[PDB]
Amino acid sequence: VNLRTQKRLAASVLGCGEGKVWLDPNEVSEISNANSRQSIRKLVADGLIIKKPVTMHSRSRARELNLARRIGRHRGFGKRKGTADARMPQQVLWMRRQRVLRRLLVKYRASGKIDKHLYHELYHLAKGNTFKHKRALVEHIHRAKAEKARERQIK
Amino acid sequence: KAQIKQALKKLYDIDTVKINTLIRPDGTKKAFARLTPDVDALDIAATKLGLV
Amino acid sequence: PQEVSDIKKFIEICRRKDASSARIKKNPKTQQIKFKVRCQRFLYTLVLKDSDKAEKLKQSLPPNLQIKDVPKRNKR
Amino acid sequence: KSLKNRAIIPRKAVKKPLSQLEDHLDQLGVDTEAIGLRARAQTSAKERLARSRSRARSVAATNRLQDGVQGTT
Amino acid sequence: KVTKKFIINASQPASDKIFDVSAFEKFLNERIKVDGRVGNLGDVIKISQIGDGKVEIIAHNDLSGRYLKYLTKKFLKKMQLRDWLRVVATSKGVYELKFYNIVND
Amino acid sequence: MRAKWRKKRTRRLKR
Amino acid sequence: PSHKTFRIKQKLAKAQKQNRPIPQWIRLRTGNTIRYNAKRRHWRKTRLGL
RNA sequence: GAAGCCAGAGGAAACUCUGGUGGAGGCUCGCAGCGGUUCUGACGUGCAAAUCGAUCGUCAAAUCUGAGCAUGGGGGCGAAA
RNA sequence: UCGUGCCCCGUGUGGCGAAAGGGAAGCCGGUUAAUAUUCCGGCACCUGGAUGUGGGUUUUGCGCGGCAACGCAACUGAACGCGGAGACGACGGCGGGGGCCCCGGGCAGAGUUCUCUUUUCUUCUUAACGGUCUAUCACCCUGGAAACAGUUUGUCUGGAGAUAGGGUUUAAUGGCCGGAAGAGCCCGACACUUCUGUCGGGUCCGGUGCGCUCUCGACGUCCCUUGAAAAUCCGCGGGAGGGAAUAAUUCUCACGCCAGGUCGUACUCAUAACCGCAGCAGGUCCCCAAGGUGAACAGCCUCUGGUUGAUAGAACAAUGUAGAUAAGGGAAGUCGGCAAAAUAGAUCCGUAACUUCGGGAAAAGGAUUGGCUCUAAGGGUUGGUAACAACCAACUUAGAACUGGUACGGACAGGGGGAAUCUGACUGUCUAAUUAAAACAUAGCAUUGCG
């Protein structure tokens, strides 16, 4: 009783690997008499041939590890294998900061809080690395507006 | 294929919609001639081709 | 495949000589009905909302153009 | 359970043994003969061409090794 | 507010007195958890019995039929009927308990 | 366009 | 290869038709000296040399 | 971390300094690939008429590589043994 | 009638040569024991040839509109010319799109269930071909800008016309629609000696990104290196001819008719289908490339998919091969520290002589690294001191307390370092099968011959 052909045909019919095909060991004679794909489909319908479910692979532990690192665990100096630039590129950080600062300057110019000359000056300062972040840029804008208002009041 | 369809028409009064051809591994040629829907391949094989 | 958005254009396509078959697809989950006519080059379809205009158009097709409602399962 | 190397076959794909079901329900204490599992438990040219196809698949048409001699001796 | 009806029909094992409907209702009462910790049935979740081995659950929150099937399988595992009883969604929001297929021997 | 297609058109006219 | 010339395929066709043992009625002829096919070829024994 | 570029502090200017940006180099560590330094290495009628293990050189190029073609022995080809 | 004659152009006049170059056109589902982008079903496309209908143009003969970029279903075009496509390097970052990976909810199914786990896992798909609305660059109109402005991660653009406002367009693997749910997939209930199936339900809605892969686009760098050709196709210049109302039409518009020949197509592509004398641990050109740890297609473990094949059983002597440990001393061993051990990731402090000023340099020498609970910082969208509200989002960085300890880059992974001398400038190359080197080559230098 050889069922290599039957296992290959059942794998082709069920659309799975040959390691996922289950042949009923109590009807090996009936499976042997099944010699075509139609007979294989009839045995699948009758339940003599079953596709086994997939071997278990869970991502649970990866999910609690992701949540723990999101909270801030497993981030110490003994958990790092790459350089600081390798984990987080400072060029990428500078690109994100420049895009944030330019977006804020464009929004302020569109809203009308600053004019074109102050916009150009702050654009070149942000390019020349005067501002670390958006809060610093907003504080400098407010301080420049306040000193301009003081100069206008003096004049 | 053009010669094959003429040969079939002259021999068995067979009209074919299309003909596929292959060359077998032993060196001969095998031809699959698909008939018109108005004729029956079972009837033709039973009467003329003798293939029962 | 082509979609026609005009009833009279679908009627003229049905009166065209090349039209060999017409069929009706009823979608109840969407509430629509599709009239599909098979010409030589293109399959022309008209989409309608479910109404009595579908049966009026069914009457409006020529009787020589044979029409079928599609089954639930496309058995061979 | 052997979930490390393989998945468990679903229970709906395996027929349950009658005596094993009766035994488990008998440990559970229900009156099996009273509740009745016995009834619930389960146990022409076309013809000529079909015969020709069956014969063609079963027996080879010719035997070039042994078609030259006919007597059994 | 939205209202959801779930039916758990154990008519055949209840008539066979294999599955205890009152014990299953109790199991639902101290196993259904609302807002992350148990004992929040309140007015949101209502479990009652009609008869003929049927339990109805009224849900005003997003209580799922998958969760009710999960709790039914947990109760079957507790009462050692997991290998012999099966929960099948025969209809929309209706889960039937039934025997697995049996062969004579 | 191409000479073959133009020849086809003028042959259609000639026929 | 799968890509093959018609001449090559014709010669492999002749090789396939030549790959056979002798008929058994050859051995019972009177004065027969042939006992086996002495030019039999196998795909893993000797090459066709094409 | 080279040119180029931005900002700030000076300097009459030229330029000086600082912080950035940038991403060059027959640059470098190193995986594949390519090669073949060392071992009282394995093997020595071997798996092998040159193989196997660890280790080592190189790795953005004078890098590796296929197919088609060219050069044919008193010849070719040779970063030259 | 034509097979006979008359002209016109004449500079030029062959073939072979790539299953990885250029190139006309096919996708999906199903089917066999073995073939399938080839068979079957559905739905298309290309080329060549004829030939009608509808529509278009025309008595202002060979269209109309928009200032323009240009648009529209058509919208004459011979000789002779012009142009484009074919048709093109390597590398670097950035942006868009498809696919893959990750997260959440919902339906159905499966598993776990001592306890816990509203739980973990699986299906949730949409091809070619078309319609329609959009998509960087670029171009057009108004206007004339220094108190220079716009703007990229990267400094370019602008009186040779910027910002701004309004548009036109190359480009889809983008949204919707047709194809097309009737398919495929998942689940359930009956029938079922076979023959064989039959009937229901669903196939949904979101998010995220220095992620992987492919492709497209705008940039930038390098060259004493500038990174194929031809077949084929198209537009233009030109105006030769042909052209209307017994209607005409030489319309690149839509629909309609016919045909598409020959040859290959199985299988392996390798620890058994090739070569090596073999079913030989060797050699042999490519495409796809999941999850976790981690900087990482490193090493280790797992999913899909494949194997469990390489003579077996018993015992544990010497000597071996491979892997290890060893008190005290620490090279006393040996020709010779051969071999092994020792160092190693990341953060921080710090780093000498010499030097062609570029390096040396990871010089050297030191301080730290687990787990848990927290804090702080770094953002996006929408909405008239908005310096405010609402909603949403993921990864880094710093600081603090507590706590286990023999050890915290807990396995894996992974520089020993320094003082000198000779030597070749360096990167590179060679004696396939005993020598990789002060050998060869190299840049630089010099000389010679030749108008």
From Swiss-Prot, chain D:
Leader peptide range in chain numbering: none
Subcellular location: Nucleus, Nucleolus
Purpose of the protein: Involved in the biogenesis of the 60S ribosomal subunit.
Family under the similarity heading: Belongs to the TRAFAC class OBG-HflX-like GTPase superfamily. OBG GTPase family. NOG subfamily.
Stated name of the protein: Nucleolar GTP-binding protein 1
Full-sequence range covered: 510 to 611 of 661
UniProtKB/Swiss-Prot annotation, chain F:
Main location per the UniProt record: cytoplasm
Keyword Ribonucleoprotein: yes
Keywords in alphabetical order: Cytoplasm, Ribonucleoprotein, Ribosomal protein
Domain of life of the native organism: Eukaryota
Region named Disordered: 1-15
GO molecular function: structural constituent of ribosome
Locations listed in the record: Cytoplasm
GO CC field: cytosol; cytosolic large ribosomal subunit
GO biological process, one term: cytoplasmic translation
Additional detail: Present with 11900 molecules/cell in log phase SD medium.
UniProt subunit comment: Component of the small ribosomal subunit (SSU). Mature yeast ribosomes consist of a small (40S) and a large (60S) subunit. The 40S small subunit contains 1 molecule of ribosomal RNA (18S rRNA) and 33 different proteins (encoded by 57 genes). The large 60S subunit contains 3 rRNA molecules (25S, 5.8S and 5S rRNA) and 46 different proteins (encoded by 81 genes).
Role: Component of the ribosome, a large ribonucleoprotein complex responsible for the synthesis of proteins in the cell. The small ribosomal subunit (SSU) binds messenger RNAs (mRNAs) and translates the encoded message by selecting cognate aminoacyl-transfer RNA (tRNA) molecules. The large subunit (LSU) contains the ribosomal catalytic site termed the peptidyl transferase center (PTC), which catalyzes the formation of peptide bonds, thereby polymerizing the amino acids delivered by tRNAs into a polypeptide chain.
UniProt family annotation: Belongs to the eukaryotic ribosomal protein eS32 family.
Name of the featured protein: Small ribosomal subunit protein eS32A
Organism: Saccharomyces cerevisiae (strain ATCC 204508 / S288c) (Baker's yeast)
Gene label: RPL41A
First and last residues shown, out of full length: 1 to 15 of 25
